Amino acid sequence: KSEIAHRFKDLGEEHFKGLVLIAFSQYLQQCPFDEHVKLVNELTEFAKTCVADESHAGCEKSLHTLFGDELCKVASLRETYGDMADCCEKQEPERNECFLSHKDDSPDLPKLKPDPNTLCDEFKADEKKFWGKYLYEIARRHPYFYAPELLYYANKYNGVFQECCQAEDKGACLLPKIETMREKVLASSARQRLRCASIQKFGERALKAWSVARLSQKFPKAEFVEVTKLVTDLTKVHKECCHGDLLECADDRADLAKYICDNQDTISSKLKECCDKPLLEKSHCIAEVEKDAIPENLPPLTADFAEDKDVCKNYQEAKDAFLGSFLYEYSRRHPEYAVSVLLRLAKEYEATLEECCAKDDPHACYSTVFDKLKHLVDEPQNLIKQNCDQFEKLGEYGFQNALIVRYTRKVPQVSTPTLVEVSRSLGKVGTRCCTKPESERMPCTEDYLSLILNRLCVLHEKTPVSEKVTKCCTESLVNRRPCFSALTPDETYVPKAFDEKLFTFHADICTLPDTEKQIKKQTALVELLKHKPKATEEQLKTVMENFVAFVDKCCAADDKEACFAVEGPKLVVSTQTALA
């Protein structure tokens, strides 16, 4: 009768406290760590009270009710967060959707530069708080981070500091490990955000479809009804995470991990290795598991979904069940496809049935449906065949630079900091993907774009300025990459007026770290194309060069500032000659 007692019992105090802490850090992103801790314990103490006495006053409230009551006691709330304190005026579930809406997906908080020595002492100073501070720093930065998975990563973090803090040159031991891990974490955020976006913007069934695709690939051996059960459970888990119900999300995720291990036979043979780890490690392992072998001799899809005479009758009888079935069959025997394409394929199959089952001889129309699809599979490979195999010549950094011009021309109205962050990430696919077996590029890249493109839609949808982008993001989820790739620059676009401040540079530029410097450098490329929408392709190879030669002189010459002072106006006036 007490949701909070139940969750404290099911998860135990340590995890309970971490999740609860993750919750605050994700709602109240600009609040300080020591405060949120203050808020975690009393809620923990309170939870202890209702497990002792479950009929005590208030332990029968929902966790949203109880958690939200805490947020609404935050002294600095309207002062720190403003309009968010309006949320406190509402009733559940409205209060919580209001709070959710104020989650900053671009909290513009300070990048964490880790000094191995100053960190390792804190680690040994206090382990558990070290772990907590980790949960906090990542969650505030990714307000939709998959919670139980964040706990897993905090654990992994300590072990890296646990086992690399007894060294001489710690720093040489650490940085590589923590750089690799934070890459995994970035990805993990991007995925969960996509799962969140599908639900909010395309409804539950969009995410179900996605889950069907993923699981049917990994467990091609399992029966469709088995796969369905995993889908609803897993969807509920994500629906819960994406709504802030972290304790319930975590608890349910654990319950799902068990069911899966308890039923390996009907599901997969590659499970035997995961289902023998501790809970967090187990679930991560299950999520990353290798796909099982496809079953032996199976009827072609054409049989049950095209040639058969009763498809419209079967489809009309239970549309979603029937479509899920199609997605099941298609995916289990095609691990090579990206789940993104599979959805694209099923979305198509649905539209034709809608069309054809309405015509006079519906079977005449649909019999050919596998002729339209078998093309949708071919469309993507080419768009992989011109680029990563474009990519080798330019290399990565060059490639990103190639992309900024292309996308900026596509959608110039987009905020610069967005184009930069995005454009960078698209280029990073090559190092990410195109090194892979040429066979598995397509799932990898189509799967990464769906992540990067989502990031774009989520940044844009708040401060919306470009209709083409709204169109591509909003129209469909499966077709976002096609909608965006299909984009062309509009001669309607009126070029951005010149602002010296954009093209002016200071000694700070040299005193920058290597990467951020690129962004500060890449930002300017962005501004030019906004300024000169119809610029050409080779002067850029010269205009950047005078620039790369510019920064070197100044970073070289003695008076670190003076060159910038006199050199700087020169490049603009030269490059402003070359503007035509």
Phi, psi of 479, rounded to the nearest 5 degrees: -95, 15
556 binds a second copy (CB under 8 A): yes
Question: Which residue's CB is nearer to ligand JGE, number 153 or number 505?
Answer: 153
Selection from a second copy, ligand JGE, Ca ion, none that 245 binds (CB < 5 to 8 A by kind) is Ca ion
- Which of a second copy, ligand JGE, Ca ion, none lies near 513, with the C-beta cut-off 5 to 8 A by kind? a second copy
**64 appears as a binding residue in the annotation:** yes
The rounded distance, in Å, linking the Cα atoms of 368 and 378 is 17
Size of the site for a second copy (CB under 8 A): 13
Exposure of 454 by Cβ count < 10 A (0-12 exposed, 13-18 middle, 19+ buried)?
buried
- Ligand-binding annotation for 531, yes or no, is no
Q: Work out how close the CB of 376 gets to a second copy at its nearest, in angstroms, rounded to a whole number.
A: 41
Number of H helices, E strands in the chain: 28, 0
Q: Which amino acid is at 81?
A: Y
For the CB of residue 238, give the shortest distance to ligand JGE in the complex, in Å: 6
How many residues in the shown chain lie near ligand JGE by CB under 6 A? Answer: 11
CA distance linking residue 504 with residue 519, whole number of Å: 15
Instruction: Confirm or reject binding of residue 248 to Ca ion (CB under 5 A).
Output: yes
In which residue are the tokens 């043979």 written? 269
3-state helix, strand, coil in the chain (%, to 5): 70, 0, 30
Choosing from 555, 571, 572, 579, the residue that interacts with a second copy (CB under 8 A) is 555
The residue from 19, 23, 150, 234 that contacts ligand JGE (CB under 6 A) is 234
Q: What is the three-class DSSP state of 568?
A: helix
When asked if residue 193 is in the footprint of ligand JGE (CB under 6 A), the reply is no
Residue type, 196: C
Of the two residues 152 and 505, which places its CB atom closer to ligand JGE in the complex? 152
CA 158 – CA 37 distance, rounded (Å) = 19
- Binding string, residues 278-317; x marks residues near a second copy by CB under 8 A: ----------------------------------------
Contact residues for 126 (Cβ-Cβ < 8 A; gap 6+): none
Decide if 84 contacts 96 (C-beta within 8 A).
Answer: no
Cis upstream peptide for 417 (omega within 30°) = no
Q: Which two tokens stand for residue 128?
A: 């558990």
Region label for 70, one of left (φ > 0), alpha (ψ between -120 and 50) or beta (otherwise): alpha
Q: Is 513 in the site for a second copy (CB under 8 A)?
A: yes
Pick out residues in 407-446 that bind ligand JGE (CB under 6 A). Answer: none
Interface mask (CB under 8 A) for a second copy, residues 10-49, using x and -?
------------------------x---------------
Q: In angstroms, what is the minimal distance from the CB of 556 to a second copy?
A: 5
Contact stretch for Ca ion (CB under 5 A) within 105-113, 161-169, 253-261, 497-505: 105-113
Report the nearest approach of ligand JGE to the CB of residue 342 (Å): 14
CB atoms within 10 A of CB 451: 19
Rule CB under 6 A: is residue 253 a binding residue for ligand JGE?
yes
SS3 464: coil
- The residue among 404, 434, 396, 433 whose CA lies nearest residue 421 is 404
556 binds, among a second copy, ligand JGE, Ca ion, none (CB under 5 to 8 A by kind): a second copy
Site string for Ca ion, 108-137 (x = CB under 5 A): x-----------------------------
Applying CB under 8 A, which part among 12-20, 198-206, 512-520, 567-575 lies near a second copy? Answer: 512-520
Is residue 439 within 8 A of residue 557, CB to CB? The reply is no
- Give which of Ca ion, a second copy, ligand JGE, none residue 256 binds (C-beta under 5 to 8 Å, depending on kind): ligand JGE
Work out the angle at residue 243's Cα, subtended by the Cα atoms of residues 15 and 93, and round it to the nearest 5 degrees. Answer: 115
- What residues contact 80, with CB distance under 8 A and at least 6 apart? 28, 30, 31, 74
Task: Provide the strand spans (E) within 164-319.
Answer: none
Give the integer Cα–Cα distance in Å for 145 and 180: 18
Q: How many residues bind Ca ion (CB under 5 A)?
A: 4
3 marked as part of a ligand binding site: yes
Contacting a second copy within 49-68 (CB under 8 A): none
Sign, CA dihedral 519-429-191-173, equals: negative
Query: Which of the choices a second copy, ligand JGE, Ca ion, none does residue 283 contact, using the CB cut-off of 5 to 8 A by kind?
Result: ligand JGE
Positions at the binding site: 3, 10, 64, 240, 243, 245, 248, 251, 255
Q: Which residues bind Ca ion (CB under 5 A)?
A: 106, 108, 245, 248
Binding site for ligand JGE (CB under 6 A): 214, 234, 237-238, 253, 256-257, 260, 283, 286-287
Which residues here bind a second copy, judged by CB under 8 A?
Answer: 34, 79, 125, 507, 510-514, 552, 555-556, 560
Extract the annotated binding site for Zn(2+).
64, 243, 245
